[PDB]
């Protein structure tokens, strides 16, 4: 169908007929051929009167009867339904994107396989929803599989769907707040499905109730009671039994098997041995009209017709969803309290219980979407409470913000709010409390999630860690050469794909790519290959980001001579405090800002004397990183002449130090004496740059040298009854548990630890092995850590690391020593 704009508005005002949802699937069940036959069925289309997107959510209409309407146990408003089809993604690993898709859904379509039933993954994921309180309603497809390949029977397929039913409430049952209710699923209740996104065909019990009711009198409700469990028609007798065995001891046939299973079971076996006299009769009694050209298809052909117009699956997915999945309204009185990360009676936290578009706002941002209108991204969201309207001034609260501080706090105005229709995009004035919405304009203040307010006083609402920060990289070279050009191409899409994937040419003539850890890594890797640049690649294992450090000051004076021998420099290192080095990374310790002013802060906060602060010559790396150069020299003839050089030859050294090339971190320099040559034409950079070098190399060396790895926080929900395969895993690592809390309603820990980023490769294996795939993962890099061990010694921790460095970057085994920058005099 096709909508105007104010046609949507209109829907998006009666709230109570909405249906934010997604569909949790096993990429191999047929996950996306349900969501093409739900779209297919009543997908939306602006009827209108060229930007694209990354189709995040699709909008479905429904419409219903009076008489259905009155069966949905929640408030409705007109007979007219927008569900909101929120994409989530394919591979489970993804975690945390997993949790974003969700957070903004109220209820899920759980797909399960006739044969197979629940398998583990999915098993995973409907255990998160259901943290979440997301109400499930379920579907088993693939039973064409069953019938073709198996040539199962009516009672042996219905026995199948019977167990599987039960497997689902057992978990549903376990994770299930209190809160929620017993949302478990019932075939007799309406929120279970069965059929086959192949052939394209499904029903419930329900669509089954109305067709024998009418046709026979008799009422629905007690016709689909009896369409499931041991209810029985006995032919001959013509009355129901409550008996299987009836009259001279005789099996009788279920009513599900008599009713539903054996007129379907009857087509596929007709079709199939295409039994030419009985297909045309059989069709008659069923009511399937062949239109035309039909009429002339048969086997497989004829049977995806003929199900469809007998079935059509869509109409059945949509019949639970409307009847049976909660709207913003009912959901977000009972899901308020998770979502909201402050008071449980703040006035926000009462607004988003009541829906309520006349709060302020508080709209959850879940993730960035790509898209064409330039190098943009557009926000994908839901209001939770108030109304988001265009060019509002907007409180943009980002990951790291709280409600006392000014951190990550950003107060701009929303240029365009538009409607995610797929791919397309539709821009509208305002958008009420309940609904999926995007936005243009935030780009450059949100990176992935976050929260828009309009209080002052409200907190940020349940965010997803997510860190920038490119721990690890990987080679990528084409295998057919003539492909190159494809993989340029393909590089340069990735990157415009992703802020937090980073592609580049290194100096060896090497395509990288780095990212934030082995689970983003194969992602981009894969679409890179397929996708992007769709050609084979050639990958080379991970390499892991270090950094080069000082444990104290130097044994001791460094000093060194340009090669000229008229100029020498003095100069020792020393560590810079943890609590200095993030300040410096913060921008708290900030190179722009008054030296005066900077010198300041380091002193009243930092212990550091106010002259050496007021004396910085410089940051670095590339004139910001976390290290030092502090002017003590007294009474220098010219020194003002030199600065540059020694500045760029700090650059040059604190970007690849001196144990294997890495950049340095927490390394204070402290220039302590200098003599120059009287001429200029003896101290220029050539002379001067390698000094400073060499001096710096020196100095560090002198300084107790050491290495940090960086070092992830990660966070685990699992069973409180299989925690213990967790610490089992993360002490086969080095790891170190931070916290371990319950929340109350749930049978669902949560551990944090911290994970050393080297220790982490086939950590999401091991982690689902140690508890059966029961472990829910998401990493973040969190900092950095020193190593004890002796970067020098080629046997030590430490040293065993930078060894395979220096080899892999084809350099001499042996780390140089200070002696050899070292210049006796």
Same mark, same amino acid.
């Given at each position: 169908?096709?909508?105007?704009?104010?046609?949507?508005?209109?829907?998006?005002?009666?709230?109570?007929?909405?249906?934010?949802?997604?569909?949790?699937?096993?990429?191999?069940?047929?996950?996306?051929?349900?969501?093409?036959?739900?779209?297919?069925?009543?997908?939306?289309?602006?009827?209108?009167?060229?930007?694209?997107?990354?189709?995040?959510?699709?909008?479905?209409?429904?419409?219903?009867?009076?008489?259905?309407?009155?069966?949905?146990?929640?408030?409705?408003?007109?007979?007219?339904?927008?569900?909101?089809?929120?994409?989530?993604?394919?591979?489970?690993?993804?975690?945390?994107?997993?949790?974003?898709?969700?957070?903004?859904?109220?209820?899920?379509?759980?797909?399960?396989?006739?044969?197979?039933?629940?398998?583990?993954?999915?098993?995973?994921?409907?255990?998160?929803?259901?943290?979440?309180?997301?109400?499930?309603?379920?579907?088993?497809?693939?039973?064409?599989?069953?019938?073709?390949?198996?040539?199962?029977?009516?009672?042996?397929?219905?026995?199948?769907?019977?167990?599987?039913?039960?497997?689902?409430?057992?978990?549903?049952?376990?994770?299930?707040?209190?809160?929620?209710?017993?949302?478990?699923?019932?075939?007799?209740?309406?929120?279970?499905?069965?059929?086959?996104?192949?052939?394209?065909?499904?029903?419930?019990?329900?669509?089954?109730?109305?067709?024998?009711?009418? !046709?026979?009198?008799?009422?629905?409700?007690?016709?689909?009671?009896?369409?499931?469990?041991?209810?029985?028609?006995?032919? !001959?007798?013509?009355?129901?039994?409550?008996?299987?065995?009836?009259?001279?001891?005789?099996?009788?046939?279920?009513?599900?098997?008599?009713?539903?299973?054996?007129?379907?079971?009857?087509?596929?076996?007709?079709?199939?041995?295409?039994?030419?006299?009985?297909?045309?009769?059989?069709?008659?009694?069923?009511?399937?009209?062949?239109?035309?050209?039909?009429?002339?298809?048969?086997?497989?052909?004829?049977?995806?017709?003929?199900?469809?117009?007998? $079935?059509?699956?869509?109409?059945?997915?949509?019949?639970?969803?409307?009847?049976?999945?909660?709207?913003?309204?009912?959901?977000?009185?009972?899901?308020?309290?998770? $979502?909201?990360?402050?008071?449980?009676?703040?006035?926000?936290?009462?607004?988003?219980?009541?829906?309520?578009?006349?709060?302020?706002?508080?709209?959850?941002?879940?993730?960035?979407?790509?898209?064409?209108?330039?190098?943009?991204?557009?926000?994908?969201?839901?209001?939770?409470?108030?109304?988001? !309207?265009?060019?509002?001034?907007?409180?943009?609260?980002?990951?790291?913000?709280?409600?006392?501080?000014?951190?990550?706090?950003?107060?701009?105005?929303?240029?365009?709010?538009?409607?995610?229709?797929?791919?397309?995009?539709?821009?509208?004035?305002?958008?009420?409390?309940?609904?999926?919405?995007?936005?243009?304009?935030?780009?450059?203040?949100?990176?992935?999630?976050?929260?828009?307010?309009?209080?002052?006083?409200?907190?940020?609402?349940?965010?997803?860690?997510?860190?920038?920060?490119?721990?690890?990289?990987?080679?990528?070279?084409?295998?057919?050469?003539?492909?190159?050009?494809?993989?340029?191409?393909?590089?340069?899409?990735?990157? !415009?794909?992703?802020?937090?994937?980073?592609?580049?040419?290194?100096?060896?003539?090497?395509?990288?790519?780095?990212?934030?850890?082995?689970?983003?890594?194969?992602?981009?890797?894969?679409?890179?290959?397929?996708?992007?640049?769709?050609?084979?690649?050639?990958?080379?294992?991970?390499?892991?980001?270090?950094?080069?450090?000082?444990?104290?000051?130097?044994?001791?004076?460094? $000093?060194?001579?340009?090669?000229?021998?008229?100029?020498?420099?003095?100069?020792?290192?020393?560590?810079?405090?943890?609590?200095?080095?993030?300040?410096?990374?913060?921008?708290?310790?900030?190179?722009?800002?008054?030296?005066?002013?900077?010198?300041?802060?380091?002193?009243?906060?930092?212990?550091?004397?106010?002259?050496?602060?007021?004396?910085?010559?410089?940051?670095?790396?590339?004139?910001?990183?976390?290290?030092?150069?502090?002017?003590?020299?007294?009474?220098?003839?010219?020194?003002?002449?030199?600065?540059?050089?020694?500045?760029?030859?700090?650059?040059?050294?604190?970007?690849?130090?001196?144990?294997?090339?890495?950049?340095?971190?927490?390394?204070?320099?402290?220039?302590?004496?200098?003599?120059?040559?009287?001429?200029?034409?003896?101290?220029?950079?050539?002379?001067?740059?390698?000094?400073?070098?060499?001096?710096?190399?020196?100095?560090?060396?002198?300084?107790?040298?050491?290495?940090?790895?960086?070092?992830?926080?990660?966070?685990?929900?699992?069973?409180?009854?299989?925690?213990?395969?967790?610490?089992?895993?993360?002490?086969?690592?080095?790891?170190?548990?931070?916290?371990?809390?319950?929340?109350?309603?749930?049978?669902?820990?949560?551990?944090?630890?911290?994970?050393?980023?080297?220790?982490?490769?086939?950590?999401?294996?091991?982690?689902?092995?140690?508890?059966?795939?029961?472990?829910?993962?998401?990493?973040?890099?969190?900092?950095?850590?020193?190593?004890?061990?002796?970067?020098?010694?080629?046997?030590?921790?430490?040293?065993?690391?930078?060894?395979?460095?220096?080899?892999?970057?084809?350099?001499?085994?042996?780390?140089?020593?200070?002696?050899?920058?070292?210049?006796?005099?």
């Amino acid at each position: 169908v096709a909508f105007t704009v104010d046609q949507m508005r209109s829907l998006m005002d009666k709230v109570t007929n909405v249906r934010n949802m997604s569909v949790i699937a096993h990429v191999d069940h047929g996950k996306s051929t349900l969501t093409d036959s739900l779209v297919q069925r009543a997908g939306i289309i602006s009827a209108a009167k060229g930007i694209t997107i990354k189709s995040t959510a699709i909008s479905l209409y429904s419409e219903m009867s009076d008489e259905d309407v009155k069966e949905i146990k929640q408030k409705t408003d007109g007979n007219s339904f927008l569900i909101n089809l929120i994409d989530s993604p394919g591979h489970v690993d993804f975690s945390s994107e997993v949790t974003a898709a969700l957070r903004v859904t109220d209820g899920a379509l759980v797909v399960v396989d006739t044969i197979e039933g629940v398998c583990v993954q999915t098993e995973t994921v409907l255990r998160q929803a259901l943290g979440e309180r997301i109400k499930p309603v379920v579907v088993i497809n693939k039973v064409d599989r069953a019938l073709l390949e198996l040539q199962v029977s009516k009672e042996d397929l219905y026995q199948t769907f019977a167990r599987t039913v039960e497997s689902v409430n057992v978990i549903v049952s376990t994770y299930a707040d209190e809160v929620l209710g017993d949302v478990q699923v019932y075939p007799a209740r309406g929120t279970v499905a069965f059929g086959s996104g192949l052939h394209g065909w499904a029903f419930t019990i329900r669509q089954f109730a109305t067709r024998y009711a009418k !046709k026979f009198g008799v009422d629905k409700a007690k016709m689909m009671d009896r369409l499931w469990g041991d209810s029985f028609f006995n032919p !001959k007798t013509k009355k129901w039994t409550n008996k299987d065995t009836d009259a001279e001891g005789k099996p009788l046939e279920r009513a599900f098997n008599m009713f539903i299973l054996d007129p379907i079971f009857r087509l596929f076996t007709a079709i199939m041995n295409f039994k030419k006299d009985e297909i045309p009769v059989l069709l008659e009694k069923l009511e399937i009209v062949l239109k035309g050209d039909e009429k002339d298809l048969e086997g497989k052909a004829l049977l995806k017709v003929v199900m469809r117009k007998f $079935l059509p699956a869509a109409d059945a997915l949509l019949e639970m969803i409307v009847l049976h999945l909660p709207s913003p309204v009912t959901a977000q009185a009972y899901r308020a309290e998770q $979502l909201y990360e402050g008071p449980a009676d703040d006035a926000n936290c009462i607004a988003i219980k009541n829906c309520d578009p006349k709060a302020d706002l508080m709209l959850y941002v879940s993730k960035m979407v790509p898209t064409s209108d330039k190098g943009r991204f557009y926000a994908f969201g839901r209001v939770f409470a108030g109304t988001v !309207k265009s060019g509002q001034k907007v409180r943009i609260q980002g990951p790291n913000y709280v409600p006392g501080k000014k951190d990550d706090l950003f107060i701009k105005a929303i240029q365009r709010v538009v409607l995610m229709m797929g791919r397309f995009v539709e821009p509208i004035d305002d958008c009420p409390a309940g609904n999926i919405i995007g936005l243009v304009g935030i780009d450059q203040f949100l990176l992935k999630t976050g929260t828009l307010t309009t209080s002052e006083t409200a907190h940020n609402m349940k965010v997803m860690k997510f860190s920038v920060s490119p721990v690890v990289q990987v080679a990528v070279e084409v295998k057919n050469a003539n492909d190159l050009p494809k993989l340029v191409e393909g590089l340069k899409r990735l990157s !415009k794909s992703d802020p937090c994937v980073l592609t580049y040419m290194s100096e060896s003539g090497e395509h990288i790519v780095a990212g934030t850890g082995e689970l983003h890594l194969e992602i981009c890797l894969q679409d890179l290959e397929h996708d992007h640049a769709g050609v084979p690649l050639k990958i080379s294992p991970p390499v892991v980001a270090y950094r080069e450090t000082v444990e104290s000051e130097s044994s001791q004076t460094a $000093l060194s001579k340009s090669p000229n021998k008229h100029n020498r420099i003095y100069l020792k290192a020393e560590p810079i405090d943890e609590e200095v080095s993030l300040a410096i990374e913060n921008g708290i310790i900030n190179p722009r800002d008054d030296f005066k002013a900077r010198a300041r802060i380091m002193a009243d906060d930092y212990g550091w004397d106010v002259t050496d602060a007021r004396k910085i010559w410089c940051f670095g790396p590339d004139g910001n990183g976390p290290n030092l150069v502090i002017d003590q020299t007294k009474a220098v003839q010219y020194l003002h002449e030199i600065k540059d050089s020694v500045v760029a030859a700090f650059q040059w050294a604190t970007k690849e130090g001196p144990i294997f090339g890495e950049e340095m971190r927490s390394v204070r320099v402290n220039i302590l004496d200098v003599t120059l040559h009287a001429d200029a034409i003896h101290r220029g950079g050539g002379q001067i740059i390698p000094t400073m070098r060499r001096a710096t190399y020196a100095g560090f060396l002198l300084a107790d040298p050491k290495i940090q790895e960086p070092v992830f926080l990660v966070e685990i929900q699992c069973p409180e009854q299989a925690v213990g395969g967790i610490y089992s895993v993360l002490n086969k690592k080095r790891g170190q548990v931070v916290s371990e809390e319950q929340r109350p309603g749930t049978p669902l820990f949560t551990v944090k630890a911290y994970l050393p980023v080297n220790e982490s490769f086939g950590f999401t294996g091991e982690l689902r092995q140690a508890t059966g795939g029961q472990a829910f993962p998401q990493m973040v890099f969190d900092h950095w850590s020193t190593l004890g061990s002796d970067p020098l010694d080629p046997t030590s921790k430490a040293g065993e690391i930078v060894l395979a460095a220096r080899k892999r970057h084809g350099m001499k085994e042996e780390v140089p020593g200070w002696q050899e920058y070292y210049d006796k005099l």
